[PDB]
Every structure is written in structure tokens, then in C-alpha cells.
């Protein structure tokens, strides 16, 4: 395909440490992590400009990220809260073009 | 000559945070392992003040190391050398033999015997109380400052939260190096507030002089200030 998120669905428990993993095959420098919620739209949590780099989006709090390699970008909830129940989307991009994954439904109890 | 800094001369963790920066970018440089290589020789150059080396570091098969000037490069060009240094990848520029890749600054010494580990002690001062010390070890008689700064920053990062994902245990501070002849110099431990996104090459370029010191005599001091 091109962008692969993993797992597609996940339940987890308050205080749990979750890693959503994202993989691209486009050789794109840039990778993004958004959450989708019916109030708001996509809101950007963290992104990354290359291996070793992470920068904060608009709603980075309670999350961290890691770009341990060109192809892989990981979103990490430290101590999960039910308010991080959401669908999470990963994207690679270049220039004005953004390639999204299929999403990751996460429920936190 | 370079005078010890005043409190208001140091970059502030809270400024980096409030200009939206991610301290973890700096954390990775010092948690992550160094590029190392014993008795290697450069295969090619890109510009004439760098040297490209074959190396194994995670998935990368070569490293461009940058020097402050051409003459520095020529000093190591084609000779048998040891490398020790801090790689970056974002903003790294390294064209193929025939773009992105692995880059660093300086880090070079001549490969000799040298052999026994030497221990160096690092005195840490926090909010003006000298309350801690820890040793680093290198087995090079002549050692680049980079190797020492890295190992010292590594320790403090693992053990004292010098750099965390989203901040630090501290607000500001610096690492001071004093040579046997009493000349000395320092490095602000934290990024410039404007340095967002974090551009690694503007933080690592202090290692570009490839400064080299005597491990037997070097004095190492770190000064930190909490909020």
C-alpha cells in the first residue's frame, strides 16, 4: 500500500503506556500524527521532519513521539487517559501532498 | 579567551518550551549511541572541508563528518583514524557516489596504540552547590572534546534528567572544560530559543573544530540551575 498504521483497533486501560506504530513506504521525510474527534477535525499532535526529529503540533500534551528510522514514526501515550479515546491517523508527506493511513481506533477505559 | 557565562547569558529551558520546541530532540542526541569506528580511512569527500567514512551505525553504511575548515579536513584525509561523535540525520546532507543519510562534526583522532582506559571525573554543581560527581572513561590519550562532552551528557541524561522529551530537571546551565595550561571554554547545554524546529547541524557544529585534549589532565565541570 503506502502508509500502514498498527494496530487498527486497540482497547487499553487508564495508566497504560500505548505505542501506535506507523510505517510508510514512500521515502518521505515528513510524517504526522493526528487524532480525529467529532467536535474538532483532524488535530495535529506531533510531526517529524526526519530520523531523530520530532516537533509538536497543536495538541501535543500527554503524548510523545519517536522517529527511530526513516520509515517509522511512533506515537506514544505515556499514562493513558479516557480522553485519549479517539481515532488516530498517521501521514507521510512532501510539498503540499499528504498520504494518510487507514486510522487506529483506540478506546481507553 | 572565553569568560564564564552569567545567568542571563544562558539559554533557558522554559524559553525553548514556550517557543514550542521539543527538548527530546536534544535528548536523542545524547541518549542515542555515538558513531564509533577504530582505524578507518575516508573513502571520499563531499565538500572539501568534510570527510566521508564507511561505517556501520544502525542501518547506515557511511558517515559524513564535517570540519570547521579545509585544512582540518586535510589533516585527516587519507590517514588511519578513530571516529567518535554524535550523528544526526534530519538536515544531514551527503550526496551518493553515483542525499539524506548520516552526518556529524569533527570526532576524529589518529589511530595509534593508546590501549588502558583512563578515568575522568566530572564535578557537577547544581544551584551553586557542588553536590555530585561521576566518572567517564575513554581509552584515548588524545581525545576529542566531543567524546568527553557526549559521555558526560549521556550520563546526566540517563541519571539526572538533563534532557527530557518535554523539558528537563533544570532551567539552564553549561559544561566547562579546563586544560592543563589553564585555558578553558564552555558550551551552553541547552538550545537557542529560536532553534525550532530543532536544526541539529546548528547545535552540533561546536564539535566542528575537532578540538583534541589530553585525557590524563583535562578538567571537566558542569554547572546547572533549576527553575
Q: Which residues in chain A are closer than 8 Å to B196, comparing Cβ atoms?
A: 55
CATH topology of domain B1-33+116-227: Ubiquitin-like (UB roll) (3.10.20)
Query: From the list B90, B165, B198, which residue is nearest A64 (CB)?
Result: B165
Cite the DSSP H helix spans in B172-217. Answer: 200-204
Q: Which residues in chain B are closer than 8 Å to A54, comparing Cβ atoms?
A: 22, 24-25
SS3 B214: strand
Interchain CB distance below 8 Å, A50 and B165: no
Q: Which residues in chain B are closer than 8 Å to A52, comparing Cβ atoms?
A: 25, 28-29, 32, 88-90, 200
- CATH for B34-115 is 2.40.50.110
Determine contact, residues B65/B210, Cβ cutoff 8 Å: no
d(CA B86, CA B76): 18
How many CB pairs below 8 Å do chains A and B form together?
Answer: 46
**Residue A66: what are its φ and ψ, rounded to 5°?**
-150, 135
User: Could you tell me which residues come within 8 angstroms of residue B146 by beta carbon, excluding any fewer than 6 positions away?
Assistant: B84, B85, B86, B105, B106, B107, B207, B210
Q: Which grid coordinates are listed for B8?
A: 542571563
A54 interfaces chain B, CB cutoff of 8 Å: yes
Reduce the secondary structure of A22-50 to three states and give it as a string.
EEECCCCCEEEEEEECCCCCEEEEEEECC
Cα distances (Å, whole numbers) of residue B158 to A6, B27, B30, B79, B96? 30, 10, 9, 35, 35
Residue B107 DSSP code: -
Cite the DSSP H helix spans in chain B. Answer: 13-18, 24-31, 70-76, 145-160, 200-204
Cα distances (Å, whole numbers) of residue A57 to A43, A64, A85, B99, B217? 8, 11, 18, 27, 46
Strands, sheet with B184-188, edge to edge from the N-terminal-most edge strand: B129-138, B118-126, B219-225, B172-178, B184-188
d(CA B191, CA A18): 29
Determine contact, residues B122/B135, Cβ cutoff 8 Å: yes
Cα distances (Å, whole numbers) of residue B79 to B83, B98, B108? 12, 24, 11
Structure resolution, Å: 2.6
d(CA B141, CA B138): 8
What residues does CATH 3.10.20.120 cover in chain B? 1-33+116-227
d(CA B152, CA B137): 10
Q: Which grid coordinates are listed for B155?
A: 550520563
Q: Which grid coordinates are listed for B27?
A: 535528548
CATH entry 2.60.40.10 includes domain A1-109? yes
Method: X-ray
Residue of B nearest to A57 (CA): B20
Q: Which grid coordinates are listed for A1?
A: 500500500
B19 interfaces chain A, CB cutoff of 8 Å: no
Strands, sheet with B103-105, edge to edge from the N-terminal-most edge strand: B50-57, B60-66, B103-105
| Strands in chain B per DSSP E | 35-40, 50-57, 60-66, 81-85, 103-105, 108-110, 118-126, 129-138, 142-144, 172-178, 184-188, 212-214, 219-225
Determine contact, residues B103/B201, Cβ cutoff 8 Å: yes
Amino acid at each position: 500500500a503506502a502508509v500502514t498504521q498498527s494496530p487498527r483497533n486497540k482497547v487499553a486501560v487508564t495508566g497504560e503506556k500505548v505505542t501506535l506504530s506507523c510505517q510508510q513506504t514512500n521515502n518521505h521525510n515528513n510524517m504526522y500524527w493526528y487524532r480525529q474527534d467529532t467536535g474538532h477535525g483532524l488535530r495535529l499532535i506531533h510531526y517529524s521532519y526526519g530520523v531523530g526529529n520530532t516537533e509538536k503540533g497543536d495538541i501535543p500534551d500527554g503524548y510523545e513521539a519517536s522517529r527511530p528510522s526513516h520509515e517509522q514514526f511512533s506515537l506514544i501515550l505515556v499514562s493513558a487517559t479516557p480522553s485519549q479515546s479517539s481515532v488516530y491517523f498517521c501521514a507521510s508527506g512532501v510539498g503540499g501532498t499528504l498520504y494518510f493511513g487507514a486510522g487506529t481506533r483506540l478506546s481507553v477505559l | 579567551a572565553q569568560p564564564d557565562p552569567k545567568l542571563d547569558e544562558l539559554n533557558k529551558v522554559s524559553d525553548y518550551k514556550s517557543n514550542k520546541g521539543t527538548m527530546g530532540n536534544v535528548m536523542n542526541l545524547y541518549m542515542s549511541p555515538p558513531v564509533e569506528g577504530r582505524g578507518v580511512i575516508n573513502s571520499r569527500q563531499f565538500l572539501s572541508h568534510d570527510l566521508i567514512f564507511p561505517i556501520e551505525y544502525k542501518s547506515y553504511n557511511e558517515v559524513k563528518t564535517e570540519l570547521e575548515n579545509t585544512e582540518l579536513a586535510n589533516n585527516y584525509k587519507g590517514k588511519k583514524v578513530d571516529i567518535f561523535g554524535v550523528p544526526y540525520f534530519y538536515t544531514c546532507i551527503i550526496p551518493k557516489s553515483e542525499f539524506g543519510g548520516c552526518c556529524m562534526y569533527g570526532g576524529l583522532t589518529f589511530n595509534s596504540s593508546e590501549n588502558r582506559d583512563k578515568l575522568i571525573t566530572v564535578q557537577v554543581t547544581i544551584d551553586n552547590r557542588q553536590s555530585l560527581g561521576f566518572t567517564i572513561t575513554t581509552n584515548k590519550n588524545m581525545v576529542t572534546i566531543q567524546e568527553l562532552d557526549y559521555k558526560a551528557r549521556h550520563w546526566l541524561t540517563k541519571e539526572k534528567k538533563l534532557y527530557e522529551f518535554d523539558g528537563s530537571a533544570f532551567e539552564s546551565g553549561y559544561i566547562k572544560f579546563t586544560e592543563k595550561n589553564n585555558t578553558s571554554f564552555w558550551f551552553d547545554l541547552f538550545p537557542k530559543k529560536e532553534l525550532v524546529p530543532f536544526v541539529p547541524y546548528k547545535f552540533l557544529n561546536i564539535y566542528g573544530d575537532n578540538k583534541v585534549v589530553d585525557s590524563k589532565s583535562i578538567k571537566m565541570e558542569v554547572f546547572l540551575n533549576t527553575h
